[PDB]
């Protein structure tokens, strides 16, 4: 299962599938063909006993309020992006949101951002043990599509029409 694909989705990709205790894998949240996309909320589940959420480009441990590192999308300052992280690190739960707020300015450009990366998080290996990270619904995302909510530039929730592609195993027991 690889990308280069016509269907609309959101996924997570790894820069590597395998790593030693203490090494960091960068996990990138990214989307494909989301119509008039203007923001995301995602809820991420991982094994805290096995993986530690860190900054991907420094290595410093995330707190319950750490920000994701930015992607290619949602960084145009003219459209007023706001970003927030509300985590439960001891349960292995990250919840990240970033949206444009100046939607009228955005709509006026007639140039929607529909495909690209959204967010980069780091995962430092604490045990070289078989482990998976998932998008997963939360009690707090009543409307979450498998732990995801995406919006368009009218401020509407995208209610269907895309796939949530789970990222696949880390350090798989061969």
């Amino acid at each position: 299962n690889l990308d280069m694909i016509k269907a609309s989705y959101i996924t997570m990709g790894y820069d590597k599938n395998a790593a030693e205790v203490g090494e960091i894998i960068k996990a990138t949240v990214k989307i494909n063909k989301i119509t008039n996309f203007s923001g995301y909320q995602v809820n991420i589940k991982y094994d805290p006993t096995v993986l530690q959420a860190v900054n991907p480009k420094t290595g410093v441990a995330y707190t319950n309020s750490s920000l994701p590192t930015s992607g290619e999308l949602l960084v145009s300052e003219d459209y007023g992006p706001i970003v927030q992280g509300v985590h439960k690190i001891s349960e292995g739960i990250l919840n990240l949101s970033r949206s444009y707020t100046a939607l009228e300015v955005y709509r006026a450009s007639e140039s929607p951002e529909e495909t690209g990366t959204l967010a980069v998080v780091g995962f430092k290996v604490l045990q070289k043990k078989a482990t998976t990270v998932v998008f997963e619904d939360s009690e707090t995302m009543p409307n979450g599509i498998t732990g995801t909510t995406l919006f368009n530039w009218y401020g509407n929730r995208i209610q269907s029409g895309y796939f949530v592609i789970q990222p696949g195993e880390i350090n798989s027991a061969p």
Side-chain angles (χ1 to χ4, degrees):
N1 198 305
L2 80 242
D3 299 307
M4 281 283 91
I5 284 174
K6 306 211 166 205
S8 297
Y9 59 81
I10 182 170
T11 202
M12 195 182 299
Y14 304 133
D15 69 349
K16 78 203 60 148
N17 23 19
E20 318 299 343
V21 181
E23 299 200 293
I24 64 133
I25 301 153
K26 62 212 60 191
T28 301
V29 174
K30 58 191 177 175
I31 51 160
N32 188 55
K33 294 201 283 181
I34 306 298
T35 300
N36 292 335
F37 171 76
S38 66
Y40 71 87
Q41 182 188 12
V42 295
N43 196 66
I44 295 174
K45 188 82 196 54
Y46 64 105
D47 194 339
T49 77
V50 174
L51 294 154
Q52 161 183 261
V54 296
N55 182 294
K57 71 165 131 79
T58 71
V60 61
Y62 271 12
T63 76
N64 281 332
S65 69
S66 299
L67 302 173
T69 312
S70 277
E72 309 159 326
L73 308 185
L74 302 182
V75 292
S76 160
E77 284 309 315
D78 292 354
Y79 305 153
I82 189 179
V83 61
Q84 195 185 356
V86 185
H87 317 317
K88 249 270 217 185
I89 295 257
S90 69
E91 295 187 317
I93 290 153
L94 305 184
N95 195 286
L96 322 168
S97 305
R98 187 174 179 110
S99 275
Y100 284 144
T101 50
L103 299 186
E104 194 173 35
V105 182
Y106 187 26
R107 291 185 305 264
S109 68
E110 299 180 336
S111 312
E113 306 175 3
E114 307 186 322
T115 300
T117 60
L118 299 191
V120 191
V121 174
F123 283 112
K124 156 178 280 151
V125 183
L126 295 178
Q127 284 173 30
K128 197 151 163 278
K129 171 177 184 176
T131 204
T132 53
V133 172
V134 298
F135 296 103
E136 168 178 297
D137 245 1
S138 152
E139 211 148 55
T140 96
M141 292 174 77
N143 301 311
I145 295 169
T146 312
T148 74
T149 291
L150 309 186
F151 295 99
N152 68 25
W153 66 11
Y154 313 99
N156 312 346
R157 198 164 59 69
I158 295 163
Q159 293 181 33
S160 72
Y162 67 90
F163 294 89
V164 171
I165 301 169
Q166 307 284 7
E169 204 163 58
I170 285 176
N171 284 327
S172 262

